Amino acid sequence: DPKIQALLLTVLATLVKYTTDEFDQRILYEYLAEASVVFPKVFPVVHNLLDSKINTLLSLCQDPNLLNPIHGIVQSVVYHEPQYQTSYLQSFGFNGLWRFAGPFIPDYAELIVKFLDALIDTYLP
Amino acid sequence: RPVEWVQAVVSRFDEQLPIKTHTKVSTEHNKECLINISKYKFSLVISGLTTILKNVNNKNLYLSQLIILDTLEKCLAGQPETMLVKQLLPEICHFLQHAAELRNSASGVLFSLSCNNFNAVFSRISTRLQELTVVDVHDIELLQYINVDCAKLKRLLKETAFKFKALKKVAQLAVINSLEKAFWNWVENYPDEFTKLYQTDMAECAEKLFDLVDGFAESTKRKAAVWPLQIILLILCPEIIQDISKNNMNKKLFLDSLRKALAGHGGSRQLTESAAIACVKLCKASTYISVIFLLVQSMVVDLKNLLFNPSKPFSVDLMIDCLVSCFRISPNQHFKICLASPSTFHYVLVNSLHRIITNLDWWPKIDAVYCHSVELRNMFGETLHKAVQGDLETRSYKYLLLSMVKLIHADPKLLLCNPGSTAELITGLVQLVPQSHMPEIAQEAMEALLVLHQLDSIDLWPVETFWEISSQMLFYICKKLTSSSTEILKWLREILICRNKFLLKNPICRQAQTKLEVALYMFLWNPDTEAVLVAMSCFRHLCEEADIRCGVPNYNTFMEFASVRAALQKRVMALLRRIEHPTAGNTEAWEDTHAKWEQATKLILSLQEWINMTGFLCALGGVCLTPVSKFMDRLLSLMVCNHEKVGLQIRTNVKDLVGLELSPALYPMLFNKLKNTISKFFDSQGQVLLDTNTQFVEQTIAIMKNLLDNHTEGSSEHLGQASIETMMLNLVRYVRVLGNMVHAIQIKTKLCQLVE
């Protein structure tokens, strides 16, 4: 299912976007290199997320182990350059996924107030 | 957003150029990624590289340009037009000792470009030809470099012939030379297409151009310039060759003039010299295939009597082309002349053999030459002997020897196949590896010895021979290493890999293994960080050897070295302390290092090497438990080193190395020697003999504090073996009689910190 591929990819990409540990990044980007080659038609979804950090790691980095996956992803992307833009997550309701899982009220809280009040009113007599 | 990240890789690659170890690995890894990206988005990568090349064009500059051009060539060779033509091609034209590398690189770029682009490069050439009809020739030189096939060659000749008479005389000359190379470019790349030519429009172009170029040839110098092309154009006309072997009269008179010029009957040396070039090019051409063989048979004997005359030497690349062609035509009279003779002939032979190996299905393989291996070995031994016992004659033996070693690198099998013989060959190569005055030869001798140590080669030298010879080489190399050491050590790593491979398929051995062990330990203190890391890597292969042998004492600590400037030396010394078990090697390494260190100590009284040697002796010395007793006495004498320029550094480093790095197994000797020394600071009435003794005491306090601070595993066991009580009593008693000055107060303070 392309939605499941897109969600999986977006989670891995989300984990790359934020995590500061280069050892985390090694593991994650190795999985993105395979995942790009595995799901090439869906991979464009993640490109916006990856773009900022991939520019950063290309221009800055000097670990070959982390770079080998990154260069693999760029190669894979160009080799298969779409059927799913970043907007695709929005259609099923996941545009916030990379939004929310970033670093640490009013609009959310009012909806939660209505939800909790409805939860009480349904469940509690 | 893919374009933006491709541009980010391009931008990374640009910023990592030398003109602006991890930066090396990063650069190559970026280059390889750009190549693999170019495999798909070719014009993005080529545009970026072109843009960078323009910026760079408008030692590190050359290296940057080489990196860009090597990248371009590999991208273009990986190709699946407008800016290739309008942007890249003019920059590659701009390039057309580092200038020759850049010209070679740019030519390889242009060749690759031209494969799929040819019509554009030809349009540039055709436009400059047109401009030349109505003098700047440089675009015409592009004909030399471009990829050419049969149809393209025909087009180049047709275009040239039409315009040639309207061109100016300098342009005509540039065209003539450039077409000569253009023909070879086709024949070399597309030998099948040249073969098919001997199995009318090409011949019409070639004849028309021949007659035009003949009409240009009004003088001795112009004749000499055109004859190498005229023979090519005649070789492009097989039916004309068949007729003139019996409109064609000027072609017959040209061949007759070449024959007369080879036979010495032409008075003009320039025409004889040019005729050699032409007839070698003919001989060469025949190897890529016929009536041409009759033409070769009419000239080859006079050509051999011109180029291979020991009584009247010709005036090397031309001679090599001749010999290689003669071998390919008939795989040996001139060969025996080259085996016997001028050293320049030995040179031409060896380089010809090297080219035969390194460059078609009917070409004779090198194996016909394996009759002459004994004579090649004799030539090697003689040349080696003459190079080592050595101005112009000496310099020539060096170039010859390099070529013979390159030949051995190209193929060992020759030398070994006709045949002690192998042992002599290997011994000669091994003797070159140490030679400081010949780094290029030594490097190639190592590569030669490496290929000689590959499985297929060793079989030809089996196991009883491998053991004796390879161990003799190891022993000799290690013995020299214990007397470019780093490169020799890297190579010794790859030799050990080969030995492990050979044994995995499976008294001098014990001596060799011991000397290797000595050498590796002695490298652990070397002032070069790279050497130390390589030596560590060598212990891995020593373990692998023992695993392979045993599968049919130090091993744990060797594997820990395998797992691994000041921080590295600290790590090394920590590992050296974990060597419990004595071996002939570690003992000898200590004794040798001690001997070297004593010599270095005297010379000092290079410093970082002495510090590292000191540290190594301190760390390893436990195994030796006398020489060690004398070294410790010498260290103790150095704690009070009064030397004005290096004394503070000596005292500091002895203190730090004894206090942090000494072997736990030596603590019982150190405390007895400190005790005995400090005890001499008292008279028979137990009164203190007060600068040297005070300085010894201060350094002793710091050394003992550092020892006692240290948590090296197993150190507790050894700290128990000798009493400190009499020493510490004598230290405090000494320090008590020091007055109440600032320095004496600091010493009292330090002794309290030690006591704690």
UniProtKB/Swiss-Prot annotation, chain B:
Changing L657P: In NF1; patient with cafe-au-lait spots; may be a distinct form of NF1. It comes from the Eukaryota. Changing R578H: In NF1; uncertain significance. Changing A285T: In a cutaneous neurofibroma from a patient with neurofibromatosis; somatic mutation. Changing L617R: In NF1; sporadic. This is Neurofibromin truncated. It comes from Homo sapiens (Human). The chain holds residues 5 to 1020 of 2839 of the full protein.
